[PDB]
Design a protein around this ligand. Structure first.
Ligand SMILES: O=c1[nH]c(=O)c2[nH]c(=O)[nH]c2[nH]1
Ligand SMILES: O=c1[nH]c(=O)c2[nH]c(=O)[nH]c2[nH]1
Ligand SMILES: O=c1[nH]c(=O)c2[nH]c(=O)[nH]c2[nH]1
Ligand SMILES: O=c1[nH]c(=O)c2[nH]c(=O)[nH]c2[nH]1
Ligand code: NA
Ligand code: NA
Ligand code: NA
Ligand code: NA
Lengths: 295, 295, 295, 295
């Protein structure tokens, strides 16, 4: 037998960092969950019980904390690039580092219409994520995403005109509920190394903001023909607004809300134009994906 | 043997309702999870396989939907009272109904600074809950709560002056992080029946708003001596502002954030006044509770 | 305002203990999750920011580990009694201790038909739990339970003869699937203190075994008239077999499996006697409870 | 813009099937969760709001149930191949089908040492999974796996001889606890179509059994030098025993159990050879992966 691929590291490393402006007294917090997996000339650890080539995963953990202490942790695209570059530059035999970061929300509280200097609220489970692959001699590949953005619109969603055969029972409709959990990923052009990532630092936060804004506005305003059509509209607008992204990927469940026929009870009308009470379905769910690039 | 207590019903009933203003075109959605358990003269179902006394839990499910169709579902204190009263009035042998409702957030989206007429976002997993007990000949007992409100403050939390013995290793501190998940419950005076609940309907939403506001403001502004002291301050202010509540109950975990000593690495200073990077701890956690009433 | 009730402590304390027989070399492991909440003369911590009366929850955590080091951790009824008694005897002003323990399964592996001396498997998420309340001057109250025991029977479950009115759509049936998650609690007679708990130590493991055996055998062999009737049969047999228990409590969901009508497709027969493929329903679910004591 | 990739379908489709031997009366149940995603000439659904090319995901759901009614659902490698082949043969414009199946455990109960004819227990959350990719003109690719197999050994695990630099604090050890959640995947040689999958049907269950047996025996008996070395041993034995598998992939977390130093309390000895009580750590965790193929 032979080792065809191998990677190892530390997962689920929770990190908090605070910044304190001592001249205004305003504090700012950051909280993330980090995973770092390494690749390189490490097969003998597997095949020959040779631990001399292992950078202990405990040491990987320490390195994450030390790196956070000595460098900015925002935007996460930059922090992940710094972290990954460290491993490939420090260890001769380590040739690739894979960094995943999940950013948790801590939004400043407003007290009596004023932003509070050191108090925060978690306003949703939506996450801002990055995947950074640092590969010796091949630069830095970054994928940015938002996930866990849950939305619903109560009307201005349609689904008709689909294929009908002997497996089909679904009725066509011109007015339904649409709800989803948004997972959206934008893939950056390859960067040659950390200097080039630094040169583009302002683009990371602005592109995340744009992706979020485009997603919400398109969802709210599109008289949707299907999930497929709406998500394509989102992707094409993001691409038009940031030339340094190569592709946009959406993964959207269709979280179904079923009409409930009550006419068996005293002739109650609760379907079609009379539909007021619905049954949210936990499973199954549609799952729709697409990757959009430039022609 | 003998049956000492018994209750049965339907759990995890998901319900959506929409309201449509046809003159402005604005839509408003409500989504909840409902549980209904019944008590009464039903022991023979257990002891004698006598199903004639069982209101099927499937029928309980249908009744929830029909009741939502025919009545307002806000505020949840009212809906739960209506639902519970139905069972005890409709079935001679059913003497108590226990209704629990969890309200999920669907907050209207703002698009380009305007509130959107039919699009919504889940801005956090915080819930608004009610527990309504309807007991024949003893009125309606209501407990209202908010839960899942997650907050953090980065400073202006202290913990010193506690008991020190041979089991104690914890250092005193005058500056720490405080983070918690707020669980807060206010218990209403008993109501004689549904007429009296109706008479107080505006008090339910305003009291929820007050409890939320008092919790956030007290958390943000209190230079906290302990979790115990801060939560008492919250409870006493709520009681002072709504005479119809009898008690306020808080249940707060202390979600610990540990300092990380890095001095072993190149003499790095990351403790005390130099603390910038911390390790959020998933477990264990402190758990602090209290029930406050009027003297 | 006034403090009407208060308790505080440490939750989610994970503990492992190993026992090593150095003469046979066999090792035995135990793993649990522990919560300890205290009550007593502690109101001034809440009302007056007086921390002098607080036994720090960090110290409670240390005490759990020290107690596990110095005493047996099985059966959990004994360990919890020891732990709770410690707090009320050591601290004059602490008058009640509430201990909850969740026991996780580590079952010895059999390798080539031989029990392995130091290797274990988690064979299910079923838990063995205890709730121990130690109250100064009122002894020791213990509730033992098993939870997370998930079972299914494919036939020999019925449900007919229930109440039918204008809210009822459910069809009667003489052959259905029955599946549940068993939650079963037996409440011991009050014990006067730790000496009396020690005197009964062998009864704790045997009574847990009996409760488990009775539950599985009754579920498997009863031609069930309803969940209500089957659970009563379980409870009465447990009571008959351990005189020192006062009550038995069951809480059972009915996890529904729905028939799927396929006759719209090529006349396929998949209902009633022809039912082969079913749709497991995640929600809603029936919930059935009862407490049985002795006449 | 242009669509670079697209797939869509139904997720989280829960399915139960029963088999009844009417001559012995023994029943056998199967329960799974199924996902089916399709690819093909469907871009116009995204770009042009052309729903005529969409096989509705609701119809995909119906097809899963109908297919389960008309065909064996074991072994899952066969069922998934049948299901995927259906879509590419039935729809001219659908060229790839991706089927994922999760098999849930329902193990027959033994009552009084006899296997019960229709009663089952869920003995762990371990799953048996398959991923089947059916691609028009390129056959059938199958990946089989077991996941959620949680084990612990209390000794005969070591970790020393690793790289030590200024990021390293971890002590070497010759005796530690090792615990993991096993995720193991074996990739079958490509099959030309459904006829060839049928010809190998007995190999699927036997290879799953072998992979499970090899994993448990190797874990139990290996005096482990590291997670890396132990997992390689497992992979190489599986490859040696089934010539039709091309690669074996393991993904193993190292779920850490920390020693607790108690010497600060009355000189208690609980480290090294005296270690009896340990602290299970929920996070972070090591993560170790490798893919093994044949030289
Ligand atoms: O937007 C949708 N797309 C689909 O492909 C689909 N299929 C289905 O059943 N409902 C929907 N809705
Ligand atoms: O606010 C707190 N209260 C306590 O009772 C306690 N105990 C502890 O260890 N930390 C804290 N903090
Ligand atoms: O065993 C059952 N008990 C009930 O009370 C009930 N109600 C229902 O709809 N199904 C069942 N089944
Ligand atoms: O088996 C192990 N492998 C590692 O790579 C590692 N790293 C670490 O800190 N502990 C371990 N243990
Ligand atoms: Na390198
Ligand atoms: Na009544
Ligand atoms: Na005492
Ligand atoms: Na095809």
């Amino acid at each position: 037998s032979a080792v065809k691929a191998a990677r190892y590291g530390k997962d689920n490393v929770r990190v908090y960092k605070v910044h304190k402006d001592e001249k205004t007294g305003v504090q700012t917090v950051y909280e993330m969950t980090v995973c770092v997996l390494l690749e390189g000339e490490i097969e003998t650890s597997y095949t020959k019980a040779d631990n001399s080539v292992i950078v202990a995963t405990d040491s990987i953990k320490n390195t994450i904390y030390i790196t956070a202490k000595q460098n900015p942790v925002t935007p996460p695209e930059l922090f992940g690039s710094i972290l990954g570059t460290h491993f490939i530059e420090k260890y001769n035999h380590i040739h690739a580092a894979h960094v995943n970061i999940v950013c948790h929300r801590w939004t400043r509280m407003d007290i009596d219409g004023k932003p509070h200097p050191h108090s925060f609220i978690r306003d949703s489970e939506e996450k801002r994520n990055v995947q950074v692959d640092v590969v010796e001699g091949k630069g830095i590949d970054i994928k940015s995403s938002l996930s866990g953005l849950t939305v619903l619109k109560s009307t201005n969603s349609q689904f008709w005109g689909f294929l009908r055969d002997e497996y089909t029972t679904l009725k066509e409709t011109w007015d339904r509920i649409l709800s989803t959990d948004v997972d959206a990923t934008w893939q950056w052009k390859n960067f040659s190394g950390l200097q080039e990532v630094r040169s583009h630092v302002p683009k990371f936060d602005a592109t995340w903001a744009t992706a979020r804004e485009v997603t919400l506005k398109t969802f709210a305003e599109d008289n949707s023909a299907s999930v497929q059509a709406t998500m394509y509209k989102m992707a094409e607008q993001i691409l038009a607004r940031q030339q340094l992204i190569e592709t946009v990927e959406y993964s959207l469940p269709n979280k179904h809300y079923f009409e409930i026929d009550l006419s068996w009870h005293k002739g109650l009308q609760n379907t079609g134009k009379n539909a007021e009470v619905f049954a949210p379905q936990s499973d199954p769910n549609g799952l729709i994906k697409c990757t959009v690039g430039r022609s």
